[PDB]
């Protein structure tokens, strides 16, 4: 009950010559891969740890001004001088004031005034960077057996965890009774951490763009500082007042924490307290099913009554899960399972939990199956006591075709050209489609970086109109397509 | 896909590290070092064009 009911679930079906399939794993999503003669497996990337960070810059979000002093010189006599202006801990500004016999020196006119204050930082946000070789992806592989999961949240016993790091290109996991699953992931073309800063402010962290983080208008330290006193642009965090050209004063702006929370609107929040472990992004992996085998194929079919302990439940993914219990003999046996029509003449549905088996009599078994749209009957057991459980799917093949088209379109909107890697059996059409997607997405990312979804909507509307009101039919079609894709991306962005 | 620059890398001594320079292709490529019994395969990505 890990990948069932997650609502971000993709069924990868089949393998290629070579017994490998291409799957992109996302943190909040799940992948269920099915191939004929092979156990169904669930995949989930559950953790991404970045180790050995290097602080790139330390920004000040809250300061205090102390040790304020001011200096002035009489008009025409040049700039005033402050010793504090020697030290870069003091933020200084120069201005003019009206001077005269009343103000206290010889002549009348605009005198020079310099006010300085010691800048001290009370709260800073630290931006950290990691090297791609230092990333580490935790992937859980749980055989979709139907055996009731052991006590816990699948962290132990059933469900094997594999750590995918760029040091080794082949990750191997032994699933007892199923053989070995080989994954060749690519943790180098995932997030692209060379362009990313790990920004943490106050028990909160974000995965932010590096240039964006370097363009932040706040006082900063180099990151190699170790002194934390020589901030660069302190003038962003102070304001000097000369309301009437009478005297100059410097006050300190308030805490920038809320303004920075607003600035982080589109960044994705991560965890940086107990290690730099984040839960956003994907991981393209090549799944090798060469040494994967169905478990319990040497067992005989169960000759005994099955009772449905938990009533058939429709899953979010057009599949049904039924929990059954065994009362017969021959403890470890194959559950006789089928989805047929009323007359029990045709097989209408595919069993997702392939090769269901009751290991022990006491333990129930969760079977997942995918019934067809409409009436179907789930047959369970041999004729004496055989269960015949009716089911109605409540859908259409056209409906699921449109729904899967929408899911693929959304995947392209999220994964860019990495969408073509999803469930790809090394095809040639997929290769050409991915190359075209790479070129088109490069152009699109150049043309639309740093614009908002409202801006994308406006641009898409404008381009669609330009295409519609075009004399050239080819240019018309091109512009209308570009505008429609841009409108789709604007509607489906900012999430 | 790529050619090595430290042509003919050889281990002169057992516990004596040897560092190879290669020129990998643009995009995805894999550096394979050793033979099958314990072969290590290293993913790399070259950013240019």
């Amino acid at each position, epitope marked *: 009950m890990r990948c069932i009911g997650i609502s971000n679930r993709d069924f990868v079906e089949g393998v290629s010559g070579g017994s490998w399939v291409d799957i992109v794993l996302e943190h909040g999503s799940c992948v269920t891969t099915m191939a004929k003669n092979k156990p169904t497996l669930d995949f989930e990337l559950i953790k991404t740890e970045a180790k*050995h960070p290097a602080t790139l810059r330390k920004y000040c979000i809250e300061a205090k001004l102390t040790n304020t002093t001011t200096a002035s010189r009489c008009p025409t006599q040049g700039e005033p001088s402050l010793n504090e202006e020697q030290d870069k801990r003091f933020v200084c500004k120069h201005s003019m004031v009206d001077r005269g016999w009343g103000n206290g020196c010889g002549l009348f006119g605009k005198g020079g005034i310099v006010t300085c204050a010691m800048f001290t930082c009370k709260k800073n946000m630290e931006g950290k960077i990691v090297q791609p070789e230092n990333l580490e992806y935790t992937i859980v592989i749980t055989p979709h057996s139907g055996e009731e999961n052991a006590v816990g949240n699948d962290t132990g016993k059933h469900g094997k965890e594999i750590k995918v790091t760029p040091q080794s290109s082949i990750t191997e996991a032994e699933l007892t009774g199923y053989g070995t699953v080989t994954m060749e992931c690519s943790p180098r073309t995932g997030l692209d951490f060379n362009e990313m800063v790990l920004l943490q402010m106050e028990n909160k962290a974000w995965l932010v763009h590096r240039q964006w983080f370097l363009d932040l208008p706040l006082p900063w330290l180099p990151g*190699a500082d*170790t002194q934390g006193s020589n901030w660069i642009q302190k003038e962003t965090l102070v304001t000097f007042k000369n309301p009437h050209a009478k005297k100059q004063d410097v006050v300190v702006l308030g805490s920038q924490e809320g303004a920075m929370h607003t600035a982080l609107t589109g960044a994705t929040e991560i965890q940086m307290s107990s290690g730099n472990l984040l839960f956003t992004g994907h991981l393209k992996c090549r799944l090798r099913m060469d040494k994967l085998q169905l478990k319990g194929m040497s067992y005989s079919m169960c000759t005994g009554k099955f009772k449905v302990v938990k009533e058939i439940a429709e899953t979010q993914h057009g599949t049904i899960v039924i929990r059954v219990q065994y009362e017969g003999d021959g403890s470890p046996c194959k559950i006789p399972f089928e989805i047929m029509d009323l007359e029990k003449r045709h097989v209408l549905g595919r069993l997702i939990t392939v090769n269901p088996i009751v290991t022990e009599k006491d333990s129930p078994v969760n079977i997942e199956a995918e019934p067809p749209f409409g009436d179907s009957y789930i047959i369970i057991g041999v004729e004496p006591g055989q269960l015949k459980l009716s089911w109605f799917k409540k859908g259409s093949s056209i409906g699921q075709m449109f729904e899967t088209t929408m899911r693929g379109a959304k995947r392209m909107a999220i994964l860019g050209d990495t969408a073509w890697d999803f469930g790809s059996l090394g095809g040639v059409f997929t290769s050409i489609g991915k190359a075209l997607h790479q070129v088109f997405g490069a152009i699109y990312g150049a043309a639309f970086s740093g614009v908002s979804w409202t801006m994308k909507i406006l641009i898409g509307v404008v381009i669609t109109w330009i295409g519609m009101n075009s004399r050239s039919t080819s240019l018309s079609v091109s512009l209308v397509l570009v505008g429609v894709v841009t409108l789709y991306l604007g509607v489906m962005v900012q999430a | 896909l790529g050619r090595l620059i430290t042509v003919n890398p050889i281990v002169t001594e057992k*516990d*004596s*590290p040897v560092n190879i320079e290669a020129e990998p292709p643009f995009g995805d490529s894999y550096i394979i070092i050793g033979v099958e019994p314990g072969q290590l395969k290293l993913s790399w990505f070259k950013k240019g064009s």
Partner: antibody
Amino acid sequence: QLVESGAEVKKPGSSVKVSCKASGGTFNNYAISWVRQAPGQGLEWMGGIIPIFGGANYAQKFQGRVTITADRSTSTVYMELSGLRSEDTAVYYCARRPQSIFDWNFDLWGRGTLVTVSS
Amino acid sequence: SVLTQPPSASGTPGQRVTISCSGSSSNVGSNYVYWYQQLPGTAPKLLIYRNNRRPSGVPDRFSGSKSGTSASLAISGLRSEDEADYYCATWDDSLSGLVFGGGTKLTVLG
């Protein structure tokens, strides 16, 4: 040749700066590291620096507590300890190694400066 | 993980003694191992650098050994001069710093 500053007596919570002058060739072609040894204890690497380049590297134990600097005009390497305590009483050595990340042979050592917190 | 050595080592003059330096793959086995001979009240003297390499001007009685994850320093013939603390130093990739063996004193008899 690698000449170190004289022994210093300090007090808890204070700071001590240890100097280590070096010849021109060793200053611009090598790296200088700082290793302490508490009496009756093993050597402990604190950090080092490539004086030609600067930007010292520090051990995790001494992170935020030590600052290694090099004076190129005087060809001298400086070490400064902040928050001195009794457990920081030990002899401090400046040692010369090649300026490569893989080779850490200190073929030349200073005599060693002993910092004590008592009389 | 870090370098570990036997705190003390005994011997007799004209003997062969080997000191073991045990660490994790992060420090020993992924980097060179350096052996230092320190006399009482004297700066440590570089004894072995890289692996099983002797600096010019050192007697051949000293021999270092490098295993996949552990290292050793062997002495050809023993004397009263060999009685001194011996340290193994190796760069640690995870610790991002140089780690010393912790010390090993050779207690020659006689």
